[PDB]
Design an enzyme around this catalytic site. Structure first.
Site, PDB file in Angstrom:
ATOM      1  N   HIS A  36     -12.478  -8.787 -17.383  1.00 16.81           N
ATOM      2  CA  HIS A  36     -11.399  -8.158 -18.133  1.00 16.81           C
ATOM      3  C   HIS A  36     -11.448  -8.407 -19.630  1.00 16.81           C
ATOM      4  CE1 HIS A  36     -10.047 -10.518 -14.534  1.00 16.81           C
ATOM      5  NE2 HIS A  36     -10.106  -9.300 -14.027  1.00 16.81           N
ATOM      6  N   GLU A  72       0.831  -1.197   0.000  1.00 15.38           N
ATOM      7  CA  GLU A  72       0.000   0.000   0.000  1.00 15.38           C
ATOM      8  C   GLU A  72       0.870   1.254   0.000  1.00 15.38           C
ATOM      9  OE1 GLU A  72      -3.273   0.431  -0.417  1.00 15.38           O
ATOM     10  OE2 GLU A  72      -3.260  -1.739  -0.775  1.00 15.38           O
TER      11      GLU A  72
END
Ligand SMILES: *[C@@H]1O[C@H](CO)[C@@H](O[C@@H]2O[C@H](CO)[C@@H](O)[C@H](O)[C@H]2NC(C)=O)[C@H](O)[C@H]1NC(C)=O
Ligand SMILES: *[C@@H]1O[C@H](CO)[C@@H](O)[C@H](O)[C@H]1NC(C)=O
Ligand SMILES: *[C@@H]1O[C@H](CO)[C@@H](O)[C@H](O)[C@H]1NC(C)=O
Ligand SMILES: *[C@@H]1O[C@H](CO)[C@@H](O)[C@H](O)[C@H]1NC(C)=O
Lengths: 595, 97
Positions: A486, A356
């Site tokens: 996708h 992160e």
């Protein structure tokens, strides 16, 4: 005069021109719904239009510049990025119908609207689709949801996407490109370059070799995973029975971490905690995040800027001021970087802070390059570097560097929880999916032969390679290949081939430099002061050098190799052999999915 | 601190596209279109001639390198003139007897 000097001369201006508008594109990625909306969405939506519109004028005159007769790739890499042909080969009439296909699944497929009698369980994300499986195991979902989800998806998404598959590939054959897939690997494949005439020659035979040794060990692992799953629902989960892809914790079941809860080996064993500070101590995540930076710069990672420190949060105010859980790299540039994620009090988000906030340090590591060149060597290199240390966050060895608990605390050798195996479920469970998903989309974009075999061949190897047999055979009314999140939205899946392998290649190198072989999963990355004095040169090179030269400093190899995965499973396999002796390896081949 | 606001401060004028480099103790005020190509565009912005002027965007959130700095250069010379621009500040208190 020659355009060679003029082309570089505009590049000086072009670099400044790109930076101004890129700041506008990444100005706000959360300022959409947090407070009332005076004007939020249209603010940067128009800015991206302005940046794209300015890009088109920049790209169009860049073509007059001499792209050819450039024998060295030191600066031609910046020329090629702007001088890409892109979508401009199509006509105005061809371009108008392309957007029609894009919005087809944007509404019907994004949200699940399928009728249910009495609304016992709707086929939608609401209310709590993923979480309801961890407490409720209703039988109706296990069969009815299979038919209902794709009934309202494949009616219109099958024929519309045919136009892009065939008609939009006419220009690819003009430019010798095999498909859009070859377009996705434009940066990987470089021709007509001195000493760097590098292509993807391994794409002929990469598929076969890497999966040779996976299958014998993969069959052993699923026996142990299914062993603990007999006592849940023996009527359907049986040694003869097979679990369809929708029964593995998702409507597609690609990630198998949901399977950990039902496979608990010892419920009576007392459990310790990684932090063990749920008391009046009131542990603060920002303090440990500050404590985790030393390990991050232990491998010479450039310090992430003061923007995160100046603006962040520890406890959510519970007001309009909120930050949605969006994990995204802040490519703001201009020396500006701010990290604003869901810094709540959760153990899960603690472990991933290495991906992160700690993964972000790669953005300004090659900030000396212009905006166009401010990137990694390839897509896989950027993603894989952030995953080197994420798997050792839950290690008690990581806690020793922290010092919050007793530094002399005993390290238990009872590492026999399926939590160790759970880490392999997501990594190896989706490996066969990414293995044959891209193979289907490689020749299918070419359209060399008719579509009389597109469906039946789509369902040929998936019934035995992964051991998933669909209860209902799909037809033209079901666009299973186009039913993914996708394929329908034209997302390049070719990254998964390189991003998965390079993470362990990067991770094994760190464990190699940390005199720790064998137990790859137990890599003692704490106090890794011995790795920063060599890897600092790789951050600076960025895209200025080929990835082949950079790979020598960690593994000394020129291709993709599978060695780290072998030693990952060896400590687990020794304890896995004894508990799998009752159950035969593998599953029934081509059994009846109905029973 | 006192020279940055959102949107960028464009009052300061700089150029990075000039036909030739400057000289020591030389001031350049005149600006001409950067006609890099041999083909004259008659002083109209476009191909083979770029805009010489440019401006930094000084938003407050810029990094230290992009942070504006005020630099003063103190030049010293001796052209054999009797002029003096200094003076001592040392004077002990006087005593008597
Ligand atoms: C990491 O190595 C450091 C030394 O390189 C050690 O940590 C120090 O240990 C001494 C006692 O030997 C303490 O006085 C210091 O306060 C410690 N410093 C820090 C930053 O912890 C130890 O070997 C390792 N530190 C760990 C595991 O926390
Ligand atoms: C709430 O306040 C700002 C004030 O302009 C608003 O623009 C934005 O939507 C919200 N800010 C954050 C950080 O969520
Ligand atoms: C070769 O490298 C130089 C280095 O600046 C670059 O300017 C040039 O465009 C490259 N290609 C040539 C000279 O064909
Ligand atoms: C756990 O067993 C290993 C041998 O497999 C041993 O090296 C280690 O000291 C043991 N840890 C204990 C007993 O805490």
């Amino acid at each position: 005069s020659t355009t060679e000097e003029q082309a570089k001369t505009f590049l000086e201006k072009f670099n400044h021109e790109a930076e101004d508008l890129s700041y506008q594109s990444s100005l706000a990625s959360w300022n959409y719904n947090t407070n009332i909306t005076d004007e939020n969405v249209q603010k940067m939506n128009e800015a991206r239009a302005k940046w794209s519109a300015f890009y088109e004028e920049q790209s169009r005159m860049a073509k007059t510049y001499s792209l050819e007769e450039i024998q060295n790739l030191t600066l031609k890499r910046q020329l090629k990025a702007l001088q890409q042909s892109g979508t401009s080969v199509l006509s105005a009439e061809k371009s108008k119908r392309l957007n029609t296909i894009l919005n087809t699944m944007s509404t019907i497929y994004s949200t699940g609207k399928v009728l249910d009698p009495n609304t016992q369980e709707c086929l939608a994300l609401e209310p709590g689709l993923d979480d309801i499986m961890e407490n409720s195991r209703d039988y109706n979902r296990r069969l009815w949801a299979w038919e209902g989800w794709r009934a309202e998806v494949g009616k219109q998404l099958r024929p519309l996407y045919e136009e892009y598959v065939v008609l939009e590939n006419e220009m690819a054959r003009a430019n010798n490109y095999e498909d859009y897939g070859d377009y996705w690997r434009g940066d990987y494949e470089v021709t007509e370059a001195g000493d760097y005439d590098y292509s993807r020659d391994q794409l002929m035979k990469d598929v076969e070799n890497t999966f040779a040794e996976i299958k014998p060990l993969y069959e052993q692992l699923h026996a142990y995973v299914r062993a603990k799953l007999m006592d849940t629902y023996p009527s359907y989960i049986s040694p003869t029975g097979c679990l369809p892809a929708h029964l593995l914790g998702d409507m597609w079941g690609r990630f198998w971490t949901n399977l950990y809860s039902l496979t608990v080996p010892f419920k009576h064993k007392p459990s310790i905690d990684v932090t063990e500070k749920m008391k009046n101590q009131s542990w603060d995540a920002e303090r440990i995040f500050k404590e985790a930076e030393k390990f991050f710069v232990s491998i010479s990672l450039p310090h992430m800027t003061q923007g995160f420190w100046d603006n962040s949060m520890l406890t959510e105010p519970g007001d309009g001021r909120k930050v949605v859980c969006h994990p995204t790299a802040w490519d703001l540039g201009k020396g500006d970087f701010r990290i604003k994620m869901c810094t709540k009090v959760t153990m899960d988000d603690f472990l991933t802070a290495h991906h992160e906030m700690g993964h972000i340090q790669y953005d300004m590591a090659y900030a000396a390059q212009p905006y166009l060149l401010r990137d990694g060597a390839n897509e896989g290199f950027h993603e894989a570097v952030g995953e080197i240390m994420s798997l050792s966050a839950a290690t008690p060895h990581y806690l020793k560097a922290l010092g919050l608990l007793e530094p002399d605390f005993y390290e238990d050798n009872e590492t026999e929880i399926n939590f160790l195996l759970k880490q392999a479920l997501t990594i190896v469970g989706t490996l066969p999916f990414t293995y044959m998903l891209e193979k289907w989309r490689w020749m299918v974009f070419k359209g060399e032969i008719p579509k009389e075999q597109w469906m039946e061949k789509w369902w040929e190897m998936k019934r035995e390679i992964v051991g998933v047999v669909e209860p209902l055979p799909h037809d033209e009314t079901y666009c299973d290949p186009a039913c993914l999140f996708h394929v329908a939205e034209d997302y390049s899946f070719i990254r998964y081939y390189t991003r998965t392998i390079y993470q362990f290649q990067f991770h094994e190198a760190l464990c190699k430099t940390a005199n720790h072989e064998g137990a790859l999963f137990k890599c003692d990355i704490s106090n890794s002061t011995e790795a920063g004095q060599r890897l600092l040169q790789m951050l600076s090179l960025g895209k200025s050098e080929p990835w082949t030269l950079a790979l020598e400093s960690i593994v000394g190899i020129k291709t993709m190799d599978v060695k780290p995965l072998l030693n990952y499973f060896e400590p687990l396999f020794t304890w896995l052999k004894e508990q799998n002796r009752n159950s035969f390896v593998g599953w029934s081949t081509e059994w009846t999915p109905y029973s | 601190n006192l020279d940055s606001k959102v949107g960028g401060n464009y009052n300061y004028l700089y150029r990075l596209f000039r036909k030739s480099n400057l000289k020591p103790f030389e001031r350049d005020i005149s600006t001409e279109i950067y006609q890099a190509g041999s083909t004259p565009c008659n002083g109209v912005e476009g191909f083979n001639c770029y805009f010489p002027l440019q401006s930094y965007g000084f938003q407050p959130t810029n990094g230290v390198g992009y942070q504006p700095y005020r630099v003063v250069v103190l030049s010293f010379e001796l052209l054999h003139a009797p002029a003096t621009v200094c003076g001592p500040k040392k004077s002990t208190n006087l005593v008597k007897n």
